[PDB]
Symmetry: C5
């Protein structure tokens, strides 16, 4: 219950590995994800060394309480991980092979600027604090790093689960702290977003555009203002249920542009009727005819400008 | 305590069984279900064998801490199960009869493509990790796999609770792992979905179709656009309260088709009026008369095409 | 720390009592209810019998760890109850009088077919598993069963808290198990249901019926379709916040019937106008006049048919 | 680990005091409030009396396990309080001075009949169960009962925190139980309820009243029915997010009355038009002119009747 | 397991420091924030002093159970913090250097009067209660007060994390209590507020203003009342999801003013039509022409008055 002594003035190397068993509950609002995995740890504690001849065993098993185990913590976790030690195996040279199953709700920022065509890199930061008698440094054993094939996140494609092999060693509260970065790369499954969100939202806008093939101000006011109600009602229906993104998103710019188009279409309908009343039906009919091409063309062009700006 | 020694070079067989006491909280959004059940374990440990004559007992009881018990874990759980050891009984031959009551929130994918006429197979994966001293293999005693008659999930018919007898034995982090798949087959209770969701949604669409028996553009604009608002408002009312399904569902296709029909009906109403105002009432009246049959026929046929594609 | 020995071959009778301190959080969506109560247990253990003369005490008090206590569990709970042992008293004959205060979230199905005039019977199932050396059977001490007068559930009248005195004894995992049924009968007290949900919903329907005293198709389309929107919007306002009931409810049938009446009223308004435009105002006016009586009469009769079917 | 012996046949007096550190999460729907506070207990145990000369200490400190401490519980809590013993000090006469910090979710009924001008008295009931060898009675020293100045509940004015000095001593399951009543008096901050809820709700009603200064049935139908939609939509916006109150509230009566006024205004608009079309414009214009005064006067009077009935 | 003895009659100084690791879950509705941090404590205990020559070590490490550690608690926490002792180091002079990693959901009031241009000061109040044999006072080690550079709150700019070096010493429950205030200053990221909430809300108001360039009462009623519906529907879309603020906010005043403008615009539309129908088109046209300037000017001025009043 004290760290192993150094042979010379070298730090203790704790080789790590994370193997994803299950990944679940990716919360976009909270920017958190719950993960269930193995955490394999390996280090040399020469005090535990033995002769397999005298012992009559080629490997010894210990209880966590019986031996020194490094305090590995996660940097970006809500509460400490719920861990269960699966196995502890000591070889005759004193090499400890530790294995545990943990479940953790990890906090990792998400960038929704390119939503719903966005990709994310989920982080899991391992950390070890160095002690009084010696310094502890983390390492990655790539043979011990991977993910179960059945690992899934509904609406996401799990690209890869890797680790940045080089640790970040730094001083914190007068002690060395070695930090490791485990990355889970995911890309969104945006298929049903076209028929369920985009297409019906465009149909409602297109219905407002039929006021350019009508001279009735009463029918035109009912067209543009009722489609604005239908649009707002449709936005409540497809609402993300997360608090509004403080920054401007791709989908957010399109929806803002759609609100601008309902305002510009009201301005046209109001101008058309005012010119018709103010004995100028030549200008009223020429504006309404221009709008039939101007509205879809300006819309198509502005969407290409946004798509270019965001991608 | 170490694992029991093999008589020959055979692995240790741990006979399992799960008996569902209560099933609750089936979350469609989270794809998780909370279960409370018994987990029975049986294996032979010859070290624990005794003579009932010398001992004066026909069965011995032990505390979990006193004897070797295999570490059985569940693969698809959020956090480790909340377990309470109910009984441990050792017979003179060394047979250990273990029993525990546990509660766990199990993660099981759900396929909503055929919703609300869908059936689901909920999984509970048992797993045991082998040690270096000896290999551990799981077995299913099907007489031990069951469920309480009073077990229920509102809106579902619990068909069966089974296990696939053959375990999935595989290597993971240089050790053998025996995995058992327990299945809970459930089928949805879609009764009230016709009168509460389908019938009122179709009525709103049918009201938009009365514009084919009217020449008033003002009454037709109020018909088709107000029914679109009534439809969107009705969708908000019958909203699933789960984030949108990343894949296209049966119900999702129908609702997309309904949005298309409101757009096509606006196009007709706009064409009818434009042909009437552009001195062509022969073409305007012939289109409106055709729509009276074309709309219900194309709808009925497209539904048959979707029903055929999904089932 | 062994069960008491039988005098003859009789099972151990554990007399139970439950005294409701507080009842709260009745969740209709989850079909669960939280309860805070006393659980009294009484059984005879002749090993604990004493002479009050030699001991100098008429009653002995023990710590739970000092004596044998039967493991009583609840069948229909989410997780095990939060229990705290209040008192353990042993009389000179060996009668143990155990008392504990517990809190538990009990799962009990709810039938909403007669909502909001429904009554429910909430269950709490006690169970004891028999042990190696002897069988354990539950009994009810009616003097120890009851509820605090201040116990309440907002929107419900707590009729009674009783128990089914005869236990359900059966075999489970090769051991006898004795089960007790504790019933809490509650009836809904929703006075405000009529003025807050029914009356405004009927007013919206009655407003659609004013189209029978109007010949204006434009005013009639605005009447029936805007009231349909107002109805749907009112249903969103009075939405139960629980996922839709898989079976058809009383309130559910009325609301379905109301949606049918909005569709039938559109059919009338469409027929009236088509007969008027197709040079038949004799038939148009006779239908509109008939509807003034037919609609309220068919509605009143259909409601009596539903009320008769559900009650 | 036995109660202190009486000098004469007197019960043990346990002096209590609750000091509110933080008050949070007042849930109107659940009728529960989460409180964090100190619980001070004082009682005399002559067995713990000592001579400060021989001991060489003026005060002795003990661990809770070392001495007898009365089992104090709260009656109206969800689960037992989360407690942490802060200090235990024994003076030479045997006086025990116990202090603990606890958090607890207290269940206390709320009366919303006068909402949002309502005041509430939140209760906390301390209770002690008497034992075999002696009776235990609670006492309160109001000098010890208080609250932190920074204690807050958003939207409420915490008037006072007190205790009813006289305990309720009663028999429960053949033992005496002494109960104390702590009371937290709070009154609502209804400031923004006039400009955010009442004022916009009245404006929507007043817009429906402009139909009394119009003869156009088409404009009157659009006025009265669209304001009914705007009212229902506004009620969804200002919805309390708690299930509807089973009893009739003040705000509930006003809103019911507002729904009645939209129905009566439709009846007027329908009568006006029917009298006009049935060659009686003398009666139609006289009703519409009467309504201009009748509607605001009947509204103003009915509100005074409700305000008088509720306050 | 006794506090250290004073050299003279001085109180024990416990030097504190908090180092923010992660900040998450800032709940505006609950006025709580979850934080993960280090808590460093330093105090002198001469009983633990040693000669480094005879002992032969830099610092002596202890288990929390082995030495006296001051009970530091947080004032404004829901439940006690989840703490993990990271390290305890004693230097030759008797200086104890304690370190722990904790997670806590801190309660801190939020002032939304200037929302969404508001800044908040989040508090974490440390407190120590003085003991029998000596008084304990808190201090701040400015070298140990800090925050990780990667600390974030989505939609907020974390300005600073400082501590009020001077503690608040006061009597509580007959004992001295030293309290420290740790402040986390945050300012909101209101960027997407303008295009996502302000601009579409103003467009809906501007559409109602087109009724000043129209004489049609039917088109004007449809303009002002349908935009009121669109506004209310847009408010439901951008609803804060927190229960209503009891005090009047900046955004709250603007939205109240917008509801007043819809009522005043209805009054104009009603007056215009009544003057027109009552043979006075000179006054009707002069009011409608005045409103074209009066409405945007009064709006712009009233907004400047509110902006001045709130900032
Ligand atoms: C309420 C329906 C509405 C106003 C906007 Se739709 C909604 N909500 C209306 O009242 N009058 C119309 O002529 N058309 C409409 O669609
Ligand atoms: C014009 C009718 C608009 C209907 C508004 C419905 C508001 C839905 C609120 C849903 C909360 C999840
Ligand atoms: Cl951790
Ligand atoms: Cl598990
Ligand atoms: Cl239980
Ligand atoms: Cl308690
Ligand atoms: Cl704390
Ligand atoms: Na064991
Ligand atoms: Na026991
Ligand atoms: Na004690
Ligand atoms: Na200690």
């Amino acid at each position: 219950v004290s760290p192993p002594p150094p042979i010379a003035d070298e730090p203790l190397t704790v080789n790590t590995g994370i193997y994803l068993i299950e990944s679940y509950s990716l919360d976009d609002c909270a920017e958190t994800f719950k993960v269930n995995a193995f955490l394999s740890l390996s280090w040399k504690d020469r005090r535990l060394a033995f002769d397999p001849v005298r012992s009559g065993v080629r490997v010894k098993t210990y209880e966590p309480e019986a031996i020194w185990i490094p305090e590995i913590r996660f940097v970006n976790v809500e509460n400490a991980r719920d861990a269960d030690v699966v196995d502890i195996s000591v070889s005759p040279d004193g090499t400890v092979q530790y294995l545990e199953r943990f479940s953790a709700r990890v906090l990792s920022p998400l960038d929704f600027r390119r939503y719903p065509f966005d990709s994310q890199t989920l982080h899991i930061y391992l950390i070890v604090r160095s002690v009084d008698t010696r310094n502890i440094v983390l390492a990655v054993d790539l043979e011990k790093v991977g993910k179960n094939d059945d690992v899934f996140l509904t609406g996401w494609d799990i690209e890869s689960f890797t680790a940045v092999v080089k640790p970040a060693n730094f001083a914190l509260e007068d002690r060395l702290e070695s930090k490791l970065d485990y990355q889970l790369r995911i890309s969104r499954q945006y298929f049903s977003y076209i028929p369920n969100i985009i297409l019906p939202m465009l149909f409602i806008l297109f219905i407002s555009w039929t006021a350019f093939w009508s001279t009735s101000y009463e029918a035109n006011v009912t067209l543009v203002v009722s489609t604005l109600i239908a649009h707002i009602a449709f936005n409540i229906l497809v609402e993300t249920n997360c608090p509004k993104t403080p920054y401007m998103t791709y989908t957010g710019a399109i929806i803002f542009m759609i609100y601008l188009f309902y305002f510009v279409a009201v301005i046209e309908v109001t101008v058309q009727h005012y010119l018709k009343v103010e004995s100028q039906p030549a200008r009223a009919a020429s504006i309404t005819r221009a709008s039939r091409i101007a509205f879809p063309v300006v819309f198509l062009l502005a969407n290409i400008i946004l798509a270019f700006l965001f991608f």
